[PDB]
Amino acid sequence: ILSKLATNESPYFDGWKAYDSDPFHPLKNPNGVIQMGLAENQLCLDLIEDWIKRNPKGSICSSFKAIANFQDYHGLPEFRKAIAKFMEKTRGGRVRFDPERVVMAGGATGANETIIFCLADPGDAFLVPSPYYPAFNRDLRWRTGVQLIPIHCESSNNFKITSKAVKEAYENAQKSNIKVKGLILTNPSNPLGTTLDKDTLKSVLSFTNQHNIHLVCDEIYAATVFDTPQFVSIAEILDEQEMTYCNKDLVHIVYSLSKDMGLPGFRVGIIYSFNDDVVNCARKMSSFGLVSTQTQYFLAAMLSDEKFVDNFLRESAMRLGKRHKHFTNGLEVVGIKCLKNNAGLFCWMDLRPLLRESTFDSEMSLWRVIINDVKLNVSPGSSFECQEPGWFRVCFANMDDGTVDIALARIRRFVGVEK
Amino acid sequence: ILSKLATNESPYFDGWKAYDSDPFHPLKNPNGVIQMGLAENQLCLDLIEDWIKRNPKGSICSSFKAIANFQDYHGLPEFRKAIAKFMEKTRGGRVRFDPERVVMAGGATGANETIIFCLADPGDAFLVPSPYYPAFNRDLRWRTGVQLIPIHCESSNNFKITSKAVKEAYENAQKSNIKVKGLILTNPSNPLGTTLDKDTLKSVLSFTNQHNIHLVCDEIYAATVFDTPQFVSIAEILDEQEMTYCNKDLVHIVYSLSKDMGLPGFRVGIIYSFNDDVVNCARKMSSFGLVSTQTQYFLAAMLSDEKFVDNFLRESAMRLGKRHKHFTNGLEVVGIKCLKNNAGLFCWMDLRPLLRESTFDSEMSLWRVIINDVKLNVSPGSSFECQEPGWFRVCFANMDDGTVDIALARIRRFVGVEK
Ligand SMILES: *Cc1c(COP(=O)(O)O)cnc(C)c1O
Ligand SMILES: *Cc1c(COP(=O)(O)O)cnc(C)c1O
Ligand SMILES: NCCOCC[C@H](N)C(=O)O
Ligand SMILES: NCCOCC[C@H](N)C(=O)O
After folding, report:
1. CA distances from A376 to A260, A284, A379, A393, A404 (A)
2. What is the full DSSP assignment across A32-43?
3. Whose CA is nearest to atom 4 of ligand 3?
4. Residues spanned by CATH 3.40.640.10 within chain A?
5. Of B381, B358, B374, B362, the residue nearest B418 (C-alpha)
6. A340: DSSP letter
């Protein structure tokens, strides 16, 4: 006699399974499936590996007893500070983050779930532009009892958020007598890999503020921007003249080191709320997903080395851009267009012309050819609740140059032999 | 407009505050408050510190990329295995643990909360003997909407669980039309520091099984036993002849390394369920509180060193016992009796004769003298929902010999100057 949650728990996992089954390897499995579905950042690990060698004092008492026995939920004082500065830094030191507000959580997964707990009761709702990070359906609803309402986005205006589409989704929900507690954005965007425009942000923070609902911003890809415009954080939107009168009790940021540092395995999630009560409730809830002191120690060390941090953010961006363009260009050879983007660890590719029809059935049909016959594991627009068929997210930050070129040839091959 | 949880959130923290304010230190603050309220294990850290030095390969790629990028929620294969054996070992290898069942969680705090999510819906109930680990009131209810029903325990039969008291609490709840989904024990016991008797366990697993409700066992102090009888794990109760027919879907274990290894800061919580569905649901929920891969690596290394593990469990028990007896004896000099115990990092001291009356008001009165005038931070029975005044939990595993002797003198002093 389990609980509802237990007693109530795989079609979009076909790609992921096809790979695990026949995993590509240059020598061992050369005709294997190339992983292009997971958003990992590895074009920089050599930068982190390096740092670790020349600095044999950023771990295991380089004070072992202290970090091992330390169990306060504000975490190590120096850990907070290094996280707050790493954040100011990512937004070009154009804003200040008070580390006394920095709260921990089980990576961004626990961050997003915890914040929802703080802003909505079972049954309440949250608005969210589509396409969006699929795990949201779990992270934001499963144990929170909170439901998600989609704000529709299409290819015409390149998938931008419009006051029309927002009030559309918003008002619509009201008819059904649904209580909307807030709106959650992802900026830079996932799966679009696009940094939201400054005015666009303003419009949304306006709508949000004009209806006293929250604006949760998951800026986890903040340090993956590799091309203009420059990333405008919500923290910056608030320090602006015309936005001075917005209620900071409605604004919150959700961060993590899993994507712009390539450390998803360290489970470093952060919640930076402009609301003191939320900061409180959020911290008390962090004792369910506190970052390991052992890991807090190591990061306080590495993130305190300005020289390293400045080099990384710069060096890393240079590679991501290099990689991205190299991939985009290859695709435009065989005539494949992508959604122009300047961030993320992937690109929003358009295969609408390869669809036999403009139906999801076709999208799923084509996708099967890619995971089985072209042997590349990629994600289909439907996985992200994209409301228009034909789009695929393709990740390019988890492999080396040679592999990126094999995939390109494979795509070049498949396309040629199709017209 | 926050959520109910946020918009709804300190008298028992007087002791904790008195210490932070005037913290004892041999030279700096010699007349300071001695910390005897926190259940930390440090009589062994030298054993762990040591191991780390002679083994400079149990951390940060001694394979950094791999552990850093690793994000599967079954965790590192070798991490599970070393945790499963460390567990078999703690129960005298008298039982076997299949590491394929080992699920992670945010320390025991996230373990206990996650399991409740899996076994009870908002409004359901759980039975729990009193006194109990105070954080339960948060860990088990706060975000689960599940309520706790106390099974009364008194000093007569030395605070044992009786079928009478259990069916008492159980049936009583039914009248009030409350749905009871299970019963959660702590063995060894907190704050009693007593390992439950073999037959006693059987009786409870019987009542539980005879009413198809769950039996969650938080055996977090399993490796702190320092005196007979020997710790009987619930895993062992199940491998017994007369218990062969009990439903394993109702039995679950909750573990952590925070108390018997002194690593509360590494947030290593485990859930070992004999129920395959719970194991599933529990794992999917672990992605909210996964142990850091960086920490999984280090533990897979140290816990794989049998020689070390055998020495530790043995060495550690020897010190805990040494310390405990030395403390108990001192107390019996001035005539202070404690509840006989063979585990934990504290002792259940009886100050009933010092109470001016048999009321909690008196208990709180006396407690004030101890935290302010005798300057020792200790926990009062009421903090643990003890239903009878006069008992105090006093922790003795977080300081050295000299400090343990100062406290004893302080208590000797206070007692003398009181009769
Ligand atoms: C990858 C991702 C996450 C996961 O963050 P973790 O730290 O790994 O938990 C959350 N949100 C978005 C939008 C992501 O892309
Ligand atoms: C100390 C304690 C906990 C906390 O375990 P953590 O790993 O620190 O989260 C849970 N339950 C009991 C009974 C405890 O004594
Ligand atoms: N979508 C389920 C959660 O897994 C985390 C996301 C992962 N980084 C990915 O991009 O698939
Ligand atoms: N009681 C609140 C949770 O803190 C954890 C428990 C701690 N180890 C203690 O013994 O006080």
Report:
1. 24, 43, 10, 12, 11
2. SBEE-SS----S
3. A135
4. 56-305
5. B374
6. -
Alpha carbon distance B416, B411 (integer Å)? 8
Tell me if A245 is assigned to a ligand binding site: no
Is residue A73 annotated as involved in ligand binding? yes
Q: Are B4 and A121 an interchain contact pair (Cβ–Cβ within 8 Å)?
A: yes
Fold exhibited by the domain A1-55+306-415: Aspartate Aminotransferase, domain 1 (3.90.1150)
Q: Which of A3, A106, A295 sits opposite B117 (nearest CB)?
A: A3
Q: Which residue has the tokens 């198809």?
A: B212
Resolution of this PDB entry, in A? 2.7
Residue with tokens 């359906």: A137
Gap between the Cα atoms of B42 and B316, Å rounded: 10
List all residues 6 or more positions away from A12 whose beta carbon is below 8 Å from its beta carbon.
A134, A380, A382, A383
B262 touches chain A (CB under 8 A): yes
How is residue A261 written in tokens?
């540092």
Query: Which letter does DSSP use for residue B23 in this model?
Result: B
CB A252 within 8 A of CB A275: yes
Distance A190 CA to ligand 2 centre (A): 37
> Which one of A6, A52, A277 has the shortest CB-CB distance to B2?
A277
User: A106 and chain B: CB distance < 8 Å anywhere?
Assistant: yes
Report the relative pairing of strands A346-350 and A391-395 from DSSP bridges. antiparallel
Output the ligand 2 site: residues, CB below 6 A.
Answer: B 39, 107-109, 133, 186, 190, 218, 220, 256, 258-259, 264, 269
Chain A interface includes B267 (CB < 8 A): yes
Distance, CA of B152 to CA of B164 (rounded, Å)? 10
Assess B264–A contact: CB distance below 8 Å, yes or no. yes
User: Could you tell me which residues are beta bridge partners of residue B300?
Assistant: none
Measure the CA–CA gap between A276 and B6, rounded to whole angstroms: 11
* Nearest-5° Cα angle at A60, B64 to A279: 90
- Listed in order, the ranges of chain A carrying CATH 3.90.1150.10 are 1-55+306-415
- Chain A 72-101, CB below 8 Å of chain B: which residues? none
A–B: how many Cβ contacts below 8 A? Answer: 187
**CA distance to partner chain B, nearest, from residue A107 (Å):** 8
**Which technique?**
X-ray
Handedness of CA A128, A130, A132, A138 (dihedral sign): positive
Contact (Cβ atoms closer than 8 angstroms) between residue B402 and residue B323: no
Beta strands in A257-327 (DSSP E): 268-273
Single out the residue of B378, B414, B389 nearest to residue B34, CA to CA: B378
Name the CATH code of domain B56-305 (choices 3.40.640.10, 3.90.190.20, 1.10.630.10, 3.40.50.300). 3.40.640.10
Helix axes A293-302, A45-54, angle to 10 degrees: 90
